[PDB]
UniProtKB/Swiss-Prot annotation:
Organism: Homo sapiens
Enzyme class: oxidoreductase
BP GO annotations: cellular response to ionizing radiation; chromatin remodeling; double-strand break repair via homologous recombination; inflammatory response; positive regulation of chromatin binding; positive regulation of double-strand break repair via nonhomologous end joining; regulation of gene expression; regulation of protein phosphorylation
Binding site for Fe cation: H182, E184, H270
Taxonomic lineage: Eukaryota, Metazoa, Chordata, Craniata, Vertebrata
Keywords per UniProt: ADP-ribosylation, Chromatin regulator, Dioxygenase, Iron, Metal-binding, Nucleus, Oxidoreductase, Transcription, Transcription regulation, Ubl conjugation, Zinc
Name by which UniProt lists this protein: Lysine-specific demethylase 4D
Compartments, record wording: Nucleus
Recorded family membership: Belongs to the JHDM3 histone demethylase family.
GO cellular component, one term: chromatin
Length: 331
């Protein structure tokens, strides 16, 4: 069995290997990359996402989100307070202000220490989940707006044509902006490209151990667990690496830098934080290997998770017994 310790793997495809996206995902899996839940892909030196980032300041962040924490430094939830719209140039200036900028630090490990010590005492503002793309239309390789759609994959594997669309999302971050512990909708893959700016640190639990994380989370967030049998679908709970280690939960960590891709694999729980002003693009995708994960994915039916239009068909076809309850939670 390849990668039996479930380490995060880093790949350096050549320009020739970068042509065929599906084939390269399958290659990475042949080497055991999925066992980690997360892989890094460093593009060939010949590749670029677009020519420059000099002309992005007028993009609008219609609903910036202030991430307010409650709890203790290593075990907390966050809620999202909506703020007034602002442009990317306005947001960048805000991120660089004395109130929000990255503190002085020695290296990524020192900054990680500072994040976990101090995150809860601040409320950073995240420009998350903005439909759009920064890939040039002429970029033919690993262009996150030109991937095969999940609806087409389901149709190819299962024969059933379904409604829905699959487009990318932009994320504008600042110091301490945080993504809570989660797997993707319907335990899909994700791919994330860090277009510009400061790094993003990731934590991940191997898919084969995801239920260990869920059991810890039920213990640590006991009111939330009573409220909902899949409350990590709410995307609000954080648990630090120190707490994970104290409770024997298997996990790994890695820092993504500008110009790098990360892939999350089906049922790979992940969480993390941004080092400073940055912009990422991400989208969900599927492969044949996903189908069995989609059929077994947990679902939130309490009302909190509320998701896209396109998840309806995935539940309806892959999980018909759960469909009626889940759709009630949507309405
Ligand atoms: O970058 C973020 O805030 C969160 N991204 C992801 O969870 C992802 O790409 O799957
Ligand atoms: Mg612009
Ligand atoms: Ni994710
Ligand atoms: Zn719920």
């Amino acid at each position: 069995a390849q990668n039996p310790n479930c380490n995060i793997m880093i790949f350096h495809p050549t320009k020739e290997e970068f042509n065929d996206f599906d084939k390269y995902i399958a290659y990475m899996e042949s080497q055991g990359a999925h066992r980690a839940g997360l892989a890094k892909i460093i593009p060939p030196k010949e590749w670029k996402a677009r020519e420059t980032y000099d002309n992005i300041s007028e993009i609008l962040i219609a609903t910036p989100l202030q991430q307010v924490a409650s709890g203790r430094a290593g075990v907390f939830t966050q809620y999202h307070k909506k703020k007034k719209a602002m442009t990317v140039g306005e947001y960048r200036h805000l991120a660089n202000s004395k109130k929000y900028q990255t503190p002085p630090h020695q290296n990524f490990e020192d900054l990680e220490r500072k994040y976990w010590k101090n995150r809860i005492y601040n409320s950073p503002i995240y420009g998350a989940d903005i439909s759009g793309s920064l890939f040039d239309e002429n970029t033919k390789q690993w262009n996150l707006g030109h991937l095969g759609t999940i609806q087409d994959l389901l149709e190819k594997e299962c024969g059933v044509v379904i409604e829905g669309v699959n487009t990318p999302y932009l994320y504008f971050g600042m110091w301490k902006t945080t993504f809570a512990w989660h797997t993707e909708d319907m335990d899909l893959y994700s791919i994330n490209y860090l277009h510009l700016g400061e790094p993003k640190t990731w934590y991940v639990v191997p898919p084969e151990h995801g239920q260990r994380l869920e059991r810890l989370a039920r213990e640590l967030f006991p009111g939330s667990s009573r409220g909902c049998g899949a409350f990590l679908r709410h995307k609000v709970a954080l648990i630090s690496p120190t707490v994970l280690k104290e409770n024997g939960i298997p996990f790994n960590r890695i820092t993504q830098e500008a110009g790098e891709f990360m892939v999350t694999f089906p049922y790979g729980y992940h969480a993390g934080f941004n080092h400073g002003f940055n912009c990422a693009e991400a989208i969900n995708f599927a492969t044949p290997r996903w189908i069995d994960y989609g059929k077994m994915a947990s679902q939130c039916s309490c009302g909190e998770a509320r998701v896209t239009f396109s998840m309806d068909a995935f539940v309806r076809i892959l999980q018909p017994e759960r469909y009626d309850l889940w759709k009630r939670g949507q309405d």
